[PDB]
Amino acid sequence: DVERFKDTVTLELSCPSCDKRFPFGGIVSSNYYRVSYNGLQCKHCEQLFTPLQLTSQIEHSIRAHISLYYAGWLQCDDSTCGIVTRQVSVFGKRCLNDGCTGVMRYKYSDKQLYNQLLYFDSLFDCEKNKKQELKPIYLPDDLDYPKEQLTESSIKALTEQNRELMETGRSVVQKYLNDC
Amino acid sequence: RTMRQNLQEASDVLDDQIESFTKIIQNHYKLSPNDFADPTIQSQSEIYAVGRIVPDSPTYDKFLNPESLSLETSRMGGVGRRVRLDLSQVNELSFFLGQIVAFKGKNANGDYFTVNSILPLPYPNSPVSTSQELQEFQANLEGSSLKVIVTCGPYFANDNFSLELLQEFIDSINNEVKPHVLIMFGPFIDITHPLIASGKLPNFPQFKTQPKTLDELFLKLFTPILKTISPHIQTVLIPSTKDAISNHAAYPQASLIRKALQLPKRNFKCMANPSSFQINEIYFGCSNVDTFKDLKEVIKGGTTSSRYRLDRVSEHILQQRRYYPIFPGSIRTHISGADLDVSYLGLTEFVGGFSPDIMIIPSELQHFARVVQNVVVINPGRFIRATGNRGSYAQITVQCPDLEDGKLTLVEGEEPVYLHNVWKRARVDLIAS
Ligand SMILES: [Zn+2]
Ligand SMILES: [Zn+2]
């Protein structure tokens, strides 16, 4: 789970009122947002997301990823070549550079897509939120590293208070995970 | 089918396109396979060759010309090798990336294939009907003409969630136009709508319980209005890969699930994207990726350039026998795209090898209806414009089939059958919505 999400990218949410953009890492610390007892709250303007305001963005990101995936970019193995192209030879694995012996692979592999969706799923997984098993959204030297750390007992409580929101966010990921 | 992309399988499909056209060319022009040879190597002799138009570099400039194209051969034809095309001896042409083509020519010196002539791909056959079938169809309609209305999303503007225009339209079709069938193309809830994209979704005071997801937004916003379409009007829904309500965001795209949309069985059918079907005798071919916007021709010649772009593009589609023949498919730059699922391009080929009587491929270009090679080609245009101004829709009115009126053509053979001549009997109006 640790290594599985190492190359996934963050879910970026935008605030409906004030338009500030931020990564959403689950019920975890952040200088941008707070999961309060009545839902996801923007720290810059204090406005609460509604469920539809959150889930429409989850779904939009998912679909951006799925669309990139279907763009079908390919990349060559050979470090001295490396070309990226959407051209597919009738021998698929064969590189289109005259004489290059490298192997071609879909640059967004279906393993990567599946991992990206499983990461999104983890964000809205209550048991994982409570056990604090989610991947951090910030490295320690990041200028936006969170100033306040949440407590375990706050996370437990806040997670149960927001169960319904979480499960509904999670169902939107599952729409595409069972279809994969 | 799941979200798997398998390179071997995708390449199989691309190989098979070249091979199946090789057989179509050989049967049509009555040539022997010994007349076909590998154009990627030097010969002293003129040869026939079939292949796919590809760029001459795999990392290529956005803008191609007649000096920067190659032909890709099949695995059996030329071990899949690609050879640069010398088009200098050919004055009139229209090519595009992914096109399968047939040439007569020669590779004189090893590094170029000089095209001496283009063997045009033959147009696919048209469907036919028996006299009995046409008489039943005549009885169905009780004299009167067949009416089919066609709309295409988006159905609401970019800055609001009003379906007032759709309500006005529904009232009109229920109580004035009274068509037999209504065909509605997505997107219904477009995932790239800017308020949907940004999550700037408001509270709806006209809903007792707010939707929590885009699927619920469809049930509260569209379903109640769609439900008001008269049960006498059969209504067909065909999705877009931009439909938030679909969970299959690749072309070809599985049909929506009607029960999930809570639409009544009495008059709603959900079809695949693409799909082909008959309304009475008329064969429809419907596809919801914007071929007309996306197909970028490389052109030479005064006669080719003086023709209408929409005619040329429709002929390419008929020749290629698939609704979106461009490959690689287009990309919107990442936001959206054709999203081709290459392994299943098979399903996007003309069903039965038949050309449709009516071909409907909605586009963001201006609405149009045109006859090309005896096929009625229709773009109904977007139902509403982004700004909220009136868009358009298409009305198709077809004279009732009559074996006595002459407008149907008897095809000669022991078993007597008739060409629908829909183009001779159909009127298409493009109406402000
Ligand atoms: Zn805010
Ligand atoms: Zn290479």
Curated annotation (Swiss-Prot), chain A:
Note the zinc finger regions (CysA-type) by start and end residue.
15-45
Q: Coordinates of motif CysB motif in the sequence?
A: 76-100
> Where on this chain does Zn(2+) 1 bind?
15, 18, 42, 45
Q: Transmembrane ranges?
A: none
The protein's job, in short, is:
Catalytic component of DNA polymerase alpha, which in complex with DNA primase (DNA polymerase alpha:primase) constitutes a replicative polymerase. POL1 has a role in promoting telomere replication during interaction with CDC13.
Entry's free-text remark on domains: The CysA-type zinc finger is required for PCNA-binding.
Describe its assembly. DNA polymerase alpha:primase is a four subunit enzyme complex, which is assembled throughout the cell cycle, and consists of the two DNA polymerase subunits A POL1 and B POL12, and the DNA primase large PRI2 and small PRI1 subunits. Subunit B POL12 binds to subunit A POL1. POL1 interacts with CDC13, POB3, SPT16 and MCM10.
Q: What else is known?
A: In eukaryotes there are five DNA polymerases: alpha, beta, gamma, delta, and epsilon which are responsible for different reactions of DNA synthesis. Present with 1050 molecules/cell in log phase SD medium.
What the record says about family reads: Belongs to the DNA polymerase type-B family.
Specify the protein name: DNA polymerase alpha catalytic subunit A
Give the residues of the full protein shown: 1273 to 1452 of 1468
UniProtKB/Swiss-Prot annotation, chain B:
Localization = Nucleus
**Keywords carried by this UniProt record:** DNA replication, Nucleus, Phosphoprotein
Q: Per the record's keyword annotation, is Phosphoprotein included, yes or no?
A: yes
Q: Give the principal location in a single coarse category.
A: nucleus
- Superkingdom of the organism of origin: Eukaryota
- Extract one GO BP annotation from the record: DNA replication initiation
Q: Which GO terms describe its cellular component?
A: alpha DNA polymerase:primase complex; nuclear envelope; nucleus
According to the UniProt entry, its GO molecular function terms are: DNA binding
Q: How is it modified after translation?
A: Phosphorylated in a cell cycle-dependent manner.
Q: Does the keyword Phosphoprotein apply?
A: yes
Q: How does it assemble?
A: DNA polymerase alpha:primase is a four subunit enzyme complex, which is assembled throughout the cell cycle, and consists of the two DNA polymerase subunits A POL1 and B POL12, and the DNA primase large PRI2 and small PRI1 subunits. Subunit B POL12 binds to subunit A POL1.
Q: What does this protein do?
A: Non-catalytic component of DNA polymerase alpha, which in a complex with DNA primase (DNA polymerase alpha:primase) constitutes a replicative polymerase. POL12 may play an essential role at the early stage of chromosomal DNA replication by coupling DNA polymerase alpha to the cellular replication machinery. Interacts with MCM10.
The UniProt similarity line reads: Belongs to the DNA polymerase alpha subunit B family.
Q: What's the further remark here?
A: Present with 11200 molecules/cell in log phase SD medium.
What is the protein's given name?
A: DNA polymerase alpha subunit B
From which source organism is this entry?
Answer: Saccharomyces cerevisiae (strain ATCC 204508 / S288c) (Baker's yeast)
